[PDB]
Amino acid sequence: MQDAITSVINAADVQGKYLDANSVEKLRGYFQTGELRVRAAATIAANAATIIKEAVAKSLLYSDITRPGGNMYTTRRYAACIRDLDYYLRYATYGMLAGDPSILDERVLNGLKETYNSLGVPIGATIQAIQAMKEVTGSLVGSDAGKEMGLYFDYICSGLS
Amino acid sequence: KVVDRLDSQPSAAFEQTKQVYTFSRYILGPHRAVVAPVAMDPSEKEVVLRAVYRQVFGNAYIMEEERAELRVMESQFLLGELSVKELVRALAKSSTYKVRFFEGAVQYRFIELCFKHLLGRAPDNHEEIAVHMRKYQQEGYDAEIDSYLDAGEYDNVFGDDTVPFLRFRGVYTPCDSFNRQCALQGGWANSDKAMGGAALSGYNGSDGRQMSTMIGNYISGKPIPYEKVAADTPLKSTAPNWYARPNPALAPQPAYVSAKEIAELRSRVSKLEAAWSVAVKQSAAAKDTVETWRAAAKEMAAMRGISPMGEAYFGGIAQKVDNGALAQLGNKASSYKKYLYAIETDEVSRLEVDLEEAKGQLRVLEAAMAKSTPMTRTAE
Amino acid sequence: MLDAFSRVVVNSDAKAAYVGGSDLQALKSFIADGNKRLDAVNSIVSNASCMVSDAVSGMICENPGLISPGGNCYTNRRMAACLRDGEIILRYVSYALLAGDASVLEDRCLNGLKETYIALGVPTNSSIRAVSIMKAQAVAFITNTATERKMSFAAGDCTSLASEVASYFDRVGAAIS
Amino acid sequence: MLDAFSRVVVNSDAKAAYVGGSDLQALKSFIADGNKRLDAVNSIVSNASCMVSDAVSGMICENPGLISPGGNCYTNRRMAACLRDGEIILRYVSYALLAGDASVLEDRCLNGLKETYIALGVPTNSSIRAVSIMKAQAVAFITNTATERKMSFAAGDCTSLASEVASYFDRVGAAIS
Amino acid sequence: MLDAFSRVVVNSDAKAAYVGGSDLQALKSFIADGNKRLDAVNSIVSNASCMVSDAVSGMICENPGLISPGGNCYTNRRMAACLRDGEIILRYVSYALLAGDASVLEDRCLNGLKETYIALGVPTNSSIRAVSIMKAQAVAFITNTATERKMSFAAGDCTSLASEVASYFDRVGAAIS
Amino acid sequence: MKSVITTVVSAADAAGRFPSNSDLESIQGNIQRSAARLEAAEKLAGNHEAVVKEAGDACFAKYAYLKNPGEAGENQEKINKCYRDVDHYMRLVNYCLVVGGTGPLDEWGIAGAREVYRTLNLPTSAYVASIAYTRDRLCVPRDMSAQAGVEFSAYLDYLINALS
Amino acid sequence: RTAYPYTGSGYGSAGVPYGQDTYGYKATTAKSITETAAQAGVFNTFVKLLNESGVEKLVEQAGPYTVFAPTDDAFAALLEPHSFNKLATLLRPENNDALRKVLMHHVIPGAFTSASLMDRAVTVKSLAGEPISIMGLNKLVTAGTAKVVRADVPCANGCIIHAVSSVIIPPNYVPVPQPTKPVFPRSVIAEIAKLPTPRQALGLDP
Ligand SMILES: *C(=C)C1=C(C)[C@@H](Cc2[nH]c(/C=C3N=C(/C=C4\NC(=O)[C@H](C)[C@H]4CC)C(C)=C\3CCC(=O)O)c(CCC(=O)O)c2C)NC1=O
Ligand SMILES: *[C@@H](C)[C@H]1/C(=C/C2=NC(=C\c3[nH]c(C[C@H]4NC(=O)C(C=C)=C4C)c(C)c3CCC(=O)O)/C(CCC(=O)O)=C2C)NC(=O)[C@@H]1C
Ligand SMILES: *[C@@H](C)[C@H]1/C(=C/C2=NC(=C\c3[nH]c(C[C@H]4NC(=O)C(C=C)=C4C)c(C)c3CCC(=O)O)/C(CCC(=O)O)=C2C)NC(=O)[C@@H]1C
Ligand SMILES: *[C@@H](C)[C@H]1/C(=C/C2=NC(=C\c3[nH]c(C[C@H]4NC(=O)C(C=C)=C4C)c(C)c3CCC(=O)O)/C(CCC(=O)O)=C2C)NC(=O)[C@@H]1C
Ligand SMILES: *[C@H](C)[C@H]1/C(=C/C2=NC(=C\c3[nH]c(C[C@H]4NC(=O)C(C=C)=C4C)c(C)c3CCC(=O)O)/C(CCC(=O)O)=C2C)NC(=O)[C@@H]1C
Ligand SMILES: *[C@H](C)[C@H]1/C(=C/C2=NC(=C\c3[nH]c(C[C@H]4NC(=O)C(C=C)=C4C)c(C)c3CCC(=O)O)/C(CCC(=O)O)=C2C)NC(=O)[C@@H]1C
Ligand SMILES: *[C@H](C)[C@H]1/C(=C/C2=NC(=C\c3[nH]c(C[C@H]4NC(=O)C(C=C)=C4C)c(C)c3CCC(=O)O)/C(CCC(=O)O)=C2C)NC(=O)[C@@H]1C
Ligand SMILES: *[C@H](C)[C@H]1/C(=C/C2=NC(=C\c3[nH]c(C[C@H]4NC(=O)C(C=C)=C4C)c(C)c3CCC(=O)O)/C(CCC(=O)O)=C2C)NC(=O)[C@@H]1C
Ligand SMILES: C=CC1=C(C)[C@@H](Cc2[nH]c(/C=C3N=C(/C=C4\NC(=O)[C@H](C)[C@H]4CC)C(C)=C\3CCC(=O)O)c(CCC(=O)O)c2C)NC1=O
Numbered sequence A: 001m002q003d004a005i006t007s008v009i010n011a012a013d014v015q016g017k018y019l020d021a022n023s024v025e026k027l028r029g030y031f032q033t034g035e036l037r038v039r040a041a042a043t044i045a046a047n048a049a050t051i052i053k054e055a056v057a058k059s060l061l062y063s064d065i066t067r068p069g070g071n072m073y074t075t076r077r078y079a080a081c082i083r084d085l086d087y088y089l090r091y092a093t094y095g096m097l098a099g100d101p102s103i104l105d106e107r108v109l110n111g112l113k114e115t116y117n118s119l120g121v122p123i124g125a126t127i128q129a130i131q132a133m134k135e136v137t138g139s140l141v142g143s144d145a146g147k148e149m150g151l152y153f154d155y156i157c158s159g160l161s
Numbered sequence B: 001k002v003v004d005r006l007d008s009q010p011s012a013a014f015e016q017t018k019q020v021y022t023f024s025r026y027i028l029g030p031h032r033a034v035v036a037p038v039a040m041d042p043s044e045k046e047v048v049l050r051a052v053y054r055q056v057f058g059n060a061y062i063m064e065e066e067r068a069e070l071r072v073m074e075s076q077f078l079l080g081e082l083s084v085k086e087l088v089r090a091l092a093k094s095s096t097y098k099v100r101f102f103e104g105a106v107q108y109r110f111i112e113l114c115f116k117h118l119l120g121r122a123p124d125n126h127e128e129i130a131v132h133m134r135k136y137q138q139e140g141y142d143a144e145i146d147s148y149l150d151a152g153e154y155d156n157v158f159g160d161d162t163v164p165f166l167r168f169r170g171v172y173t174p175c176d177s178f179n180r181q182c183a184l185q186g187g188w189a190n191s192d193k194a195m196g197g198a199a200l201s202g203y204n205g206s207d208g209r210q211m212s213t214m215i216g217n218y219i220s221g222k223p224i225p226y227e228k229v230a231a232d233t234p235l236k237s238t239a240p241n242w243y244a245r246p247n248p249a250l251a252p253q254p255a256y257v258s259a260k261e262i263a264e265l266r267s268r269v270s271k272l273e274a275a276w277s278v279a280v281k282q283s284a285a286a287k288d289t290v291e292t293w294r295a296a297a298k299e300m301a302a303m304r305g306i307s308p309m310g311e312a313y314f315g316g317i318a319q320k321v322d323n324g325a326l327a328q329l330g331n332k333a334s335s336y337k338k339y340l341y342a343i344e345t346d347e348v349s350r351l352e353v354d355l356e357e358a359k360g361q362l363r364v365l366e367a368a369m370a371k372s373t374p375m376t377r378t379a380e
Numbered sequence C, D, E: 001m002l003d004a005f006s007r008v009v010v011n012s013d014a015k016a017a018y019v020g021g022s023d024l025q026a027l028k029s030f031i032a033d034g035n036k037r038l039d040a041v042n043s044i045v046s047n048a049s050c051m052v053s054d055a056v057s058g059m060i061c062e063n064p065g066l067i068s069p070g071g072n073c074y075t076n077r078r079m080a081a082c083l084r085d086g087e088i089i090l091r092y093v094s095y096a097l098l099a100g101d102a103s104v105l106e107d108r109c110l111n112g113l114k115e116t117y118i119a120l121g122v123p124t125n126s127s128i129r130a131v132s133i134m135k136a137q138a139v140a141f142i143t144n145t146a147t148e149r150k151m152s153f154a155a156g157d158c159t160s161l162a163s164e165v166a167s168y169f170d171r172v173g174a175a176i177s
Numbered sequence F: 001m002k003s004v005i006t007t008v009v010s011a012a013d014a015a016g017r018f019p020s021n022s023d024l025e026s027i028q029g030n031i032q033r034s035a036a037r038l039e040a041a042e043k044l045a046g047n048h049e050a051v052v053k054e055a056g057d058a059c060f061a062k063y064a065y066l067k068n069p070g071e072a073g074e075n076q077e078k079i080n081k082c083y084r085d086v087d088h089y090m091r092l093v094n095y096c097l098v099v100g101g102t103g104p105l106d107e108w109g110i111a112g113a114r115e116v117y118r119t120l121n122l123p124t125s126a127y128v129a130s131i132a133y134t135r136d137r138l139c140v141p142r143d144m145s146a147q148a149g150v151e152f153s154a155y156l157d158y159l160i161n162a163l164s
Numbered sequence G: 001r002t003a004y005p006y007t008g009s010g011y012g013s014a015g016v017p018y019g020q021d022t023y024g025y026k027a028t029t030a031k032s033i034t035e036t037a038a039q040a041g042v043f044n045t046f047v048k049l050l051n052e053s054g055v056e057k058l059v060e061q062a063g064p065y066t067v068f069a070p071t072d073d074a075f076a077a078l079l080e081p082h083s084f085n086k087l088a089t090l091l092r093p094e095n096n097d098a099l100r101k102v103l104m105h106h107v108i109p110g111a112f113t114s115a116s117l118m119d120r121a122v123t124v125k126s127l128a129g130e131p132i133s134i135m136g137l138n139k140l141v142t143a144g145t146a147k148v149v150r151a152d153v154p155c156a157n158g159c160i161i162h163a164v165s166s167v168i169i170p171p172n173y174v175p176v177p178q179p180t181k182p183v184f185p186r187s188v189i190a191e192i193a194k195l196p197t198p199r200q201a202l203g204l205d206p
């Protein structure tokens, strides 16, 4: 994993240079918005249970998926349903804090499209469930805090399709 | 009863636009009705004159050296005794029109251009084409322009003050004739000098043949291929810019196809549309788990009513019953929102969407396989 | 056709969503830089009459058979039409820079352009270069580095608008390629 | 459309040459024999009403299956519609004989006549007997070698003009095949 | 195009700097006359959009049964496609002049061309003409003895390069004959 | 759609002119009026489910004949497809406020609605008694700003004018 | 009776083995970028340039790339009068650094598939350092001036390959000039004869 601070240290170190003016400007961009992410990161951790409960019921609850013969039918399949959505919500909160989506490519999108295709999980429905989870999570942290939040929800859906 | 009158009839006295134009592709693009008002400023006599030279010449480009023959009939319009239907009669009878679209054109191509320019209507059936040939051979070019305009069709559609436009009529009298219109107005960036080969057949752009393709579709009643309606078309100039889940756009014909990947695609559409026939039948009765208990759960909940909202004490504590129409049924906001997510959640709609993504890919992979002997191949 | 504001409406419609918290923030930075966009469109419509002769005549000097007899820009009417289609392309790229979205390029500028060039006989290799020279001119006028004309702007960078207009001059340079 | 004089114009321009003393010797003999062309073409128009009934009724007695039920001139509609095209073939070689060139012939008469006859299903060998029976009468009028009707002229060689229109009916047969 | 010669990789982290163990002895010895060779190729690619346009127009006036109705170049789909084949035939020949072997010409253009024309009914005896017209333009443009365009080359001699491209053109005119 | 930008590029392209000076001037008014109507679109995005619920049962309290057998509210499936339609009209008004003009309500919400409500026998007074309720619930300094409440209640009255 | 069954054994299953073959974590059958291109037989010129220029060292790394390799007909289409003026000097055996900057422009970091680019305009930075535009509208995917013909070819380390019809030139690319001979000042007095003096700088002299 590399955050916004480490990503600028990387760009400088590959040239052997100290931190110049263009580098110190990117560092102030992170520090100035830093205590806003720490406030949004605690607000989502407190509403994690309801962000998923309202996203599921609104998106895929009375759908054919929960009826006999579909995916998420058995209780284990339902429990693996809502266990996956909390994985995305918990990792998108790690990315908004670090300001760099590098943690999502190593520990979330690490070949997740092949796993969902083999098992038979509907990729079209999981992308719309994450999207439904973006409209309820955005009404909590506001627009300015939701900008960096929704930036990573679309990263998971784009890296999943 | 959806529509009440077609566009081939005159407008009724209680409407601004016609009814069939209100939900057509007329509202979505540039093919609309430009009307000249009662008293015209000289700046907004250009807005009517640029629209005439768009339509009646079919996106041909009149240079100013050759717009000089039109200043006599331009000024007769700018004065105001030539209406728009009389300006286009003299413009069709001009010399710059007969050089472009008559003096090198086969007689099929000249009639289908006059159907595109004077009317907003590709030629409908064959005996209509035949009777319009059978005036020019007997009466010459002069009276034949009075065939298109001095009938009931021009007065009912354009009147005398609207510039002609490509009509998106709604109701098409053959349904093939919608395809002819899309094959004739084929592109915003196109023009009949290109589509008729009238620049490449001649010398330095002059002396061109205005030869027609799709002649045999007039005589033998045969449909237009779907590529000529979806890739270079008025439907791309009037594109609704929707989200469409079967996206109608024609993908580019790929280089490097192989007969292996066509056979897997051809097989999997037979797996999908056989599954669709056995899933559509399965649905409409036993699809719903909570449906057989609905009459038993509807007879259990029909007592304990609180008219002045705020009853159901359940002890001495208070409960806040609301008497809305939705919440009386026990429903939430997610009860009406589930109808929006039935595209990646329904099993009958997932099959049909996945079927027509595949016949989209199959219609362009098969047609690229119509190429031959010196073809270099690949390893996927 | 669409602009930058309606393009995010039809992508939110594809998810049945309201244009909400994190979806509006990118549009509030489209109007926060909305004056640099108006300052950048004005650079191109100012020098537009000399943008299409710096480019068309710069194509003749590289492929000199275009004016040789039998060539595509040989007579006066064929040369007049090439300058007439040269500025009609720059006219639609200016609408795409103004609207912030390339819908007008797809819906009505390029709707049949590759088909109509083969039907006429326009050489498509040279007509890339007439569009490719205009790309070099337009990023010089937006970053204010034209070597024979300077215009007066406020201080700041327009690096992002110079790359976006570079994206429209090669969507045209690839949809007839 | 063109004529015999404009034929050497588009050819000399294609290699960018002045029309000079070499290529004018054929045109100078073309204008000098052009008086005999003027009282050549006048033979055709004076008989062209009578010529088609002399030449399409030879088509229906050389192949009398066409007047049968199911034959392709059975109806009262189709017997007129063959007489409708019995003379338009002659009308566009009268244009080509008076012009000395067939650029107006194969741009309004044979510009998709083969595909029209296939899509209609007009029997394409009787059609060649609707041209060659005109040919045996058209040069019979040009060379003044008609048996029944005679016309007044002045003597001299007329055979290259009978041959130039014998080239203008072989263009008909070699196209609609 | 960019495989026609050799290059020297001189930086570490490349594996061709060290572990190549091999030099292109036939492509390093081929830059011996490479400067003269690149001027012969540049002589053709600067003239290419007129060479194909002259040669296809040079045979229509030499066999006027092609743009006759029913002839193989009458319709618009076929006139453009014959123009495309000359642009491809000439382009492969230039590659062979650049790389100095007929390998890319015999594999990428001639391998499977004779069968294709007689599968499409393409008249080949007029198709070998347009190559033999394009062969004469290539030997004028390389020896700089063309009439109405000259260029500024270094003073020297470009024979043994004009006979080498004389071999690549009747290699085309024999593989399809 | 119908925006500020699309009207000044389609009137220009009809004429054949570059973006002129009166064109860039009208797009400056898109910058001033922006933050008023981007403030009412965000108030609608985060509070719509409480608006649609309250606007929906105003339709059935006013007309209770709809819940009879025979009418357009006879079961739970048609009632859910009623509150769904209010949430469609409320979502298009949010799309109109973001675009700038009446683009989305014309092509997606009006163009044909006079026909599909006649054949399916949906009463249209029941549609407008839900939209007029929300226009009259707008307490203009509490819900949003005073200039946002103008931009919000403009498309609300545009819709009632189109259905009535 | 269904359409999309679920994999698994035991009770509450459908009859389909886990992962469709009892293989939950399947092994990689795809091969590297450099050898999946050499196998197709149409990226012949492209892969040969990667080996001669040295760019092959980073095309094999594990980093998720999105290559836009040009077909052999694309490299043969550089014989155009215009594009030849820009790249004809890359044939010289000493201009290898210029070839590396023209090749590395086609290696995009990230895995952009043809379906994710549907109706989306994306701008990224190549491995050369310059910004590149990728936008698929109306199912017409074009990378700069490429207009991809063959959409997707999956490769070893989760990388993607697309086939383009042209060669993409970097934005701020200046063609290296032809080799020239050094020129020296013939006379030194003529050097002084072109330098203005202080009198001429003040206007007191001609
Ligand atoms: C019609 C029957 C007819 C023609 C059309 C015309 C075509 C033609 N041209 C040649 C010979 C050459 N053509 C050349 C081409 C060009 N010269 C130029 O400067 C420009 C760039 C280009 C044309 C735009 C050249 C260089 C030659 C060689 C002769 C010379 O020195 O110019 C032929 C064949 C003659 C031969 O191959 O020897 C033809 C058919 N000529 C026609 O007769
Ligand atoms: C990048 C292309 C340029 C550059 C651009 C900047 N322009 C800035 C401000 C600016 N420009 C205008 C005029 C513009 N607005 C309009 O409404 C109209 C016409 C109707 C036009 C032409 C205005 C009004 C402004 C605002 C400042 C002012 O003049 O009062 C600007 C400042 C940043 C910002 O305002 O956000 C920049 C950087 N400057 C450059 O360095 C390059 C060359
Ligand atoms: C072979 C086809 C013919 C034949 C041809 C000859 N015609 C000769 C002369 C000729 N014809 C006309 C009339 C013509 N010119 C016109 O302007 C008009 C109409 C307005 C017509 C019909 C004229 C005027 C002449 C010139 C003689 C004269 O009348 O003064 C001719 C003489 C040779 C020559 O002119 O060089 C020949 C051989 N003659 C035949 O016997 C067969 C039928
Ligand atoms: C409840 C307060 C309403 C009411 C609503 C009903 N609507 C029914 C069907 C229906 N409605 C629409 C229009 C709607 N769909 C859209 O996509 C948009 C805008 C984006 C709108 C405004 C359509 C197209 C349809 C037909 C398809 C469908 O089922 O959605 C409906 C069912 C009637 C039936 O099945 O016969 C009801 C009950 N009914 C009321 O009483 C008030 C007016
Ligand atoms: C309804 C049961 C279908 C469906 C229909 C749609 N049709 C759309 C446009 C359209 N429909 C027709 C068919 C009809 N019109 C005729 O004139 C004739 C014959 C004379 C027939 C059978 C035509 C020809 C057209 C195109 C003409 C036009 O748009 O003016 C349409 C709109 C598509 C759009 O706006 O892009 C729809 C939705 N769609 C369905 O899902 C069911 C299966
Ligand atoms: C110039 C940079 C080119 C070139 C251009 C020629 N174009 C000729 C005709 C022509 N061009 C267009 C394109 C244009 N019209 C549009 O509506 C749009 C998109 C909105 C575009 C880009 C059209 C439609 C036509 C046909 C004109 C007509 O039908 O009258 C042309 C020949 C004109 C003639 O033959 O009279 C030329 C020479 N040629 C070149 O060599 C450079 C590369
Ligand atoms: C032109 C001077 C000829 C002539 C040419 C035609 N060729 C036609 C189609 C065609 N030609 C080729 C070969 C060409 N394509 C290549 O990729 C390569 C090199 C690798 C070469 C030499 C192919 C493969 C095709 C079919 C593909 C296509 O048509 O796009 C053609 C059209 C045939 C038709 O429409 O029936 C013509 C007219 N024909 C002539 O009359 C002159 C002599
Ligand atoms: C052949 C058809 C000509 C001709 C050619 C000669 N060129 C000679 C030298 C030369 N040519 C170039 C340009 C060439 N080199 C490149 O690297 C590129 C593209 C990037 C091109 C087009 C250069 C740079 C040079 C070197 C300058 C010099 O050495 O003077 C040359 C003399 C050297 C040699 O023979 O190898 C000749 C003879 N000369 C002719 O007479 C015909 C017309
Ligand atoms: C063979 C003939 C020939 C030409 C005509 C020019 C044409 C030309 N100009 C530029 C490059 C440019 N061209 C212009 C155009 C103009 N500058 C202005 O200020 C005017 C408004 C307008 C002239 C009417 C501009 C602004 C640039 C960018 C650099 C600059 O001039 O400051 C380029 C791209 C860079 C390059 O390849 O060199 C070309 C090909 N070059 C040629 O080789």
Ligand SMILES: C=CC1=C(C)[C@@H](Cc2[nH]c(/C=C3N=C(/C=C4\NC(=O)[C@H](C)[C@H]4CC)C(C)=C\3CCC(=O)O)c(CCC(=O)O)c2C)NC1=O
Binding pocket: D057, D060, D067, D074, D075, D076, D079
């Ligand atoms: C399907 C509808 C249909 C018809 C209506 C008829 C009409 C008809 N009659 C004739 C043809 C003829 N018709 C007559 C008729 C007459 N001459 C006279 O002296 C009388 C006045 C008159 C009838 C009593 C003669 C003499 C001919 C021969 C002329 C010729 O063939 O050149 C022809 C030309 C072809 C042919 O000869 O067979 C046709 C189409 N035939 C049809 O197939």
Ligand SMILES: C=CC1=C(C)[C@@H](Cc2[nH]c(/C=C3N=C(/C=C4\NC(=O)[C@H](C)[C@H]4CC)C(C)=C\3CCC(=O)O)c(CCC(=O)O)c2C)NC1=O
Binding pocket: B106, B107, B129, B130, B131, B133, D056, D059, D066, D072, D073, D077, D078, D079, D081, D082, D083, D084, D085, D086, D088, D089, D108, D109, D113, D116, D120, D122, D123, D126, D127, D130
């Ligand atoms: C501009 C060029 C031009 C022409 C050359 C003619 C030729 C021509 N004839 C017909 C149409 C026809 N052409 C014939 C002709 C014949 N049947 C035979 O047995 C003979 C071989 C031959 C005449 C002797 C017949 C019989 C019809 C009518 C077909 C029918 O009515 O079913 C058509 C189709 C149009 C239509 O049917 O209205 C055309 C183009 N007309 C033109 O406009």
Ligand SMILES: C=CC1=C(C)[C@@H](Cc2[nH]c(/C=C3N=C(/C=C4\NC(=O)[C@H](C)[C@H]4CC)C(C)=C\3CCC(=O)O)c(CCC(=O)O)c2C)NC1=O
Binding pocket: D047, D050, D051, D053, D054, D055, D057, D058, D060, D061, D062, D133, D136, D137, D140, D141, D145, D146, D147, D148, D149
């Ligand atoms: C089945 C019925 C049937 C016929 C009607 C004739 C029709 C006919 N006439 C001619 C042959 C001819 N036909 C004409 C035409 C005419 N002659 C004139 O004087 C008039 C101006 C015009 C009739 C109105 C001419 C001028 C000749 C040349 C012989 C001559 O008359 O000098 C020919 C070709 C050569 C020949 O046979 O001589 C034919 C087929 N033959 C038949 O088998």
Ligand SMILES: C=CC1=C(C)[C@@H](Cc2[nH]c(/C=C3N=C(/C=C4\NC(=O)[C@H](C)[C@H]4CC)C(C)=C\3CCC(=O)O)c(CCC(=O)O)c2C)NC1=O
Binding pocket: F043, F044, F047, F048, F050, F051, F054, F137, F138, F139, F140, F141, F142, F143
């Ligand atoms: C999209 C825009 C938007 C709105 C307009 C409101 C609409 C609205 N207002 C209220 C709720 C309220 N609205 C008012 C306001 C008023 N009551 C009066 O008697 C005065 C006339 C008026 C002041 C202007 C009051 C006092 C309440 C609380 C009591 C009540 O619900 O009636 C509620 C109930 C939930 C809540 O408290 O918010 C809703 C949905 N909400 C929105 O999301």
Ligand SMILES: CCC1=C(C)/C(=C/C2=NC(=C\c3[nH]c(/C=C4\NC(=O)[C@H](C)[C@H]4CC)c(C)c3CCC(=O)O)/C(CCC(=O)O)=C2C)NC1=O
Binding pocket: A060, A065, A071, A072, A073, A076, A077, A078, A080, A081, A082, A084, A085, A087, A107, A108, A112, A115, A119, A121, A122, A123, A125, A126, A129, G006, G007, G008
């Ligand atoms: C930390 C990153 C990470 C992710 C994302 C992850 C996913 C993952 N999802 C799984 C299953 C599953 N995933 C779902 C998911 C869904 N059902 C639906 O209807 C929706 C479309 C979708 C989301 C709600 C279901 C139903 C299963 C059970 C499949 C089975 O038991 O056979 C499994 C198999 C293991 C198990 O049975 O629990 C893994 C490993 N693992 C990880 O390590």
